[PDB]
C-alpha cells in the first residue's frame, strides 16, 4: 500500500513537469533568436558587406 | 602609423560594442 | 625600428583576436 501511493505521487509530478519543460523550451528558443538577431545588428560598423555577412 | 590607428580602432570598436549592449539591454 | 613595430603588431593582433572572440560569442 505504500508503494502503490508513491507510484501515483511520482506519476502526477511527471505529468506536470513535462508540461513545465515544454513551456521552457518555447521560452528559451525566443531568447536564442533574440540574442542572435540582436548581436547580428552590430554589422553596421562596416558597410553593406559587413551587414549581410553577419 | 597603421599599427597605432588599428590599435585605437580596436579599442573604439570594443567601447562601441559595450555601449550598444548597454543600450540594448535597456 | 623593426623590433618596436613587431612589438606593437603583436599587441595589436592580440587585441584583434580578443575583439573577434568577443563579437563571435555574441
Percentages helix, strand, coil for chain A (3-state, rounded to 5) are: 80, 0, 20
- Are the CB atoms for C22 and A42 separated by under 8 Å? no
Residue whose C-alpha is closest to residue B25's, from A40, A1, C26, A38: A38
Neighbours of chain B (3+ CB pairs under 8 A): A, C
Q: Is A53 exposed, middle or buried (0-12, 13-18, 19+ CB in 10 A)?
A: exposed
User: DSSP code of B25?
Assistant: T
List the determination method.
cryo-EM
* CA dist., res. A24 & res. A16, Å (int): 13
Q: Dig out the grid coordinates for C10 from the structure.
A: 603583436
Residue whose C-alpha is closest to residue B6's, from C12, C20, C21: C12
* CA dist., res. B20 & res. C19, Å (int): 15
Q: Which residue has the cell 584583434?
A: C16
Neighbours of chain C (3+ CB pairs under 8 A): A, B
| Residues within 8 A of B (CB atoms), C 1-26 only | 5, 8-9, 11-12, 15-16, 19, 22-23, 26
Amino acid at each position: 500500500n505504500n508503494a502503490s501511493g508513491k507510484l501515483l505521487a511520482l506519476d502526477s509530478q511527471l505529468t506536470n513537469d513535462f508540461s513545465e519543460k515544454s513551456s521552457y523550451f518555447q521560452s528559451q528558443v525566443d531568447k536564442i533568436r533574440k540574442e542572435a538577431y540582436a548581436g547580428a545588428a552590430a554589422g553596421v560598423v562596416a558597410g553593406p558587406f559587413g551587414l549581410i555577412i553577419s | 602609423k597603421t599599427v597605432e590607428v588599428v590599435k585605437n580602432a580596436i579599442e573604439t570598436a570594443d567601447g562601441a560594442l559595450d555601449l550598444y549592449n548597454k543600450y540594448l539591454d535597456q
